[PDB]
Symmetry: C2
Subunit: 91 residues, 2 copies
Amino acid sequence: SDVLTVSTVNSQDQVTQKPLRDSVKQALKNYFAQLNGQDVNDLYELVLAEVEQPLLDMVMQYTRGNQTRAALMMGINRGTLRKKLKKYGMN
Amino acid sequence: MFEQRVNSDVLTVSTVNSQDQVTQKPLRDSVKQALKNYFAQLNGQDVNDLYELVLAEVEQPLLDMVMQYTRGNQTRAALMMGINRGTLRKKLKKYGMN
DNA sequence: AAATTTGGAGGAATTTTCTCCAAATTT
DNA sequence: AAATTTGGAGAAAATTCCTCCAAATTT
């Protein structure tokens, strides 16, 4: 039922999927824990960049550099894709 | 006195390595592996919503945590996320968290 | 009581999508 | 040679942000 999962291992060396949202959640819990009442300012751009970069990279790999197919897959505009690629210096 | 913390080591996840040691790896890698498994479990089908898929998959925990952190306070949450309060309410509604 | 938050307007600012085109590139 | 892709326009559609305001809630 969960299309986006990652692989985990337990103490008995058994491997098991878990939703990406669990990773995101753990990472954030850790983030909020490490800072002690320090102020957060741009958390959305932070995470969004942290997630957009490997996405673009993997979809660009899957379509062997074909931006149009990448854009079709992702469900965004070819221009938007171009913009995002520019943003993270992947061109 | 202050060691450089790279952007990729700001949001990290505990992992286990070939010497059974617990180490923090970037969230990037989690996203990368999830996507790699998604592609691998595709076997030639057409996709048209991958961005929305990932974005939902990532927005939901973010809103969950930021709402827990601010104790339900949408204004603080909006202020630390760096988005408008109306946008935040929109998103919260979208995922039934309002 | 005073300060802050909320829910929601109307409208401006920004972003994304759409429809082109011609040059470049792949097939 | 034919088909596809790329880069980039200008305009439409859509989303986000801004600026309020009275009621509701918290301090």
